[PDB]
């Protein structure tokens, strides 16, 4: 009953490691979760909607993980704070590469995939600006760029660059170097200047 | 003869201001340039190949423009040097928004659009790292991150963020704020930490 949903979801995740959404049919999703095509249609309107449910769970996992960090401050320097935060995304999306890759491709195609991405980006940017602002108020960060514009550009960098790394794109920062790379750019631009 | 090619190219550019490639047919390209469908096929294999020729000319215009700057150093501070360079891309792509937007969408679909992008990105990154390195050698920039990894991340930021701005995406930096925003992040991260 609820198993079947999870099974359809685990099946699409597995099949996306090997091939793109366009190359996975409803039939393959049904088969893999051990159910018929019309039983599939009872849980999902389309394969597309399977991607979106997967993407939704990744995005919320990153989100919840970032909330957790916010409710319990790590006893540490300013560099490590930023690093820990950026690491929520590196680990969460980086443990879900096929879904990341496919969810990103679907922004071109699906207005809901586009709007789910857009909603959380705005949320993660507003939080980065709140923290930059907090940092400015206590006198640790200088008042340079508008905090919101700086956070916008830093979030957008992290999106393209984390995602280029996970996909092994040319060019990209090697995955084992990407965290350090982002964290130097966040910390120099936030504290410098 | 050669007019016809330019006319087909100017027509696709115009039609892309209003609608996506998928919504422009070969027929519309033919009509707009004042020729038949089969006369179209004599200049181009597909609409797709029309996009790619347009994208090729934009990319080379940015490229040539960046070469020019390199052959005649502006008599100026380090911030303005970077600003002038980033401005080549802001102006070039930003004067060609529909082609930018469509060329970017086509990376998902066209291996040649993907490979043309990938080739110039590698070139623009190698040049940014050469200049960062040069800057380190003269003692103006500190040896922090590997120059090539830093340039990778800065180029990728500029791509997503310039392109998000030109498309009016949510979120995005306002277009009238994006240059200043990028330039503070390049200069703090290159000279800081
Ligand atoms: C200590 C703190 N870190 C953050 C924070 C850290 C990283 C990011 S992020 O890496 O820029 N995430 C948004 C884009 C993802 C799709 C890759 C966003 C916010 C906010 S407060
Ligand atoms: C003074 C100099 N500036 C550069 C330089 C400046 C900007 C950029 S760039 O803005 O990062 N361009 C590559 C991506 C485009 C599609 C947006 C790349 C290199 C190299 S040397």
Curated annotation (Swiss-Prot), chains A, B:
Organism: Mycobacterium tuberculosis (strain ATCC 25618 / H37Rv)
DNA-binding region: 25-44
Activity regulation as described: Inhibited by tert-butyl 4-(3-thiophen-2-yl-1,2,4-oxadiazol-5-yl) piperidine-1-carboxylate (RF1) and 1-(thiophen-2-ylacetyl)-4-(3-thiophen-2-yl-1,2,4-oxadiazol-5-yl)piperidine (RF3).
Taxonomic lineage of the native organism: Bacteria, Bacillati, Actinomycetota, Actinomycetes, Mycobacteriales
Domain HTH tetR-type: 2-62
Further facts: Binding of inhibitors to EthR induces a conformational change in this repressor, which is then unable to bind its DNA operator, consequently allowing for increased transcription of EthA and bioactivation of ethionamide (ETH).
Site (Inhibitor-binding) residue list: 155, 158
Any one biological process term the GO annotation gives: negative regulation of DNA-templated transcription
Annotated function: Involved in the repression of the monooxygenase EthA which is responsible of the formation of the active metabolite of ethionamide (ETH).
Disruption phenotype: Cells lacking this gene leads to ETH hypersentivity.
GO molecular function: DNA-binding transcription factor activity; transcription cis-regulatory region binding
Keywords assigned by UniProt, alphabetized: DNA-binding, Repressor, Transcription, Transcription regulation
Example of a GO cellular component annotation carried by this entry: cytosol
Stretches that traverse the bilayer: none
Gene: ethR
Superkingdom classification of source: Bacteria
Subunit structure: Homodimer.
Entry annotated with the keyword Repressor: yes
Name by which UniProt lists this protein: HTH-type transcriptional regulator EthR
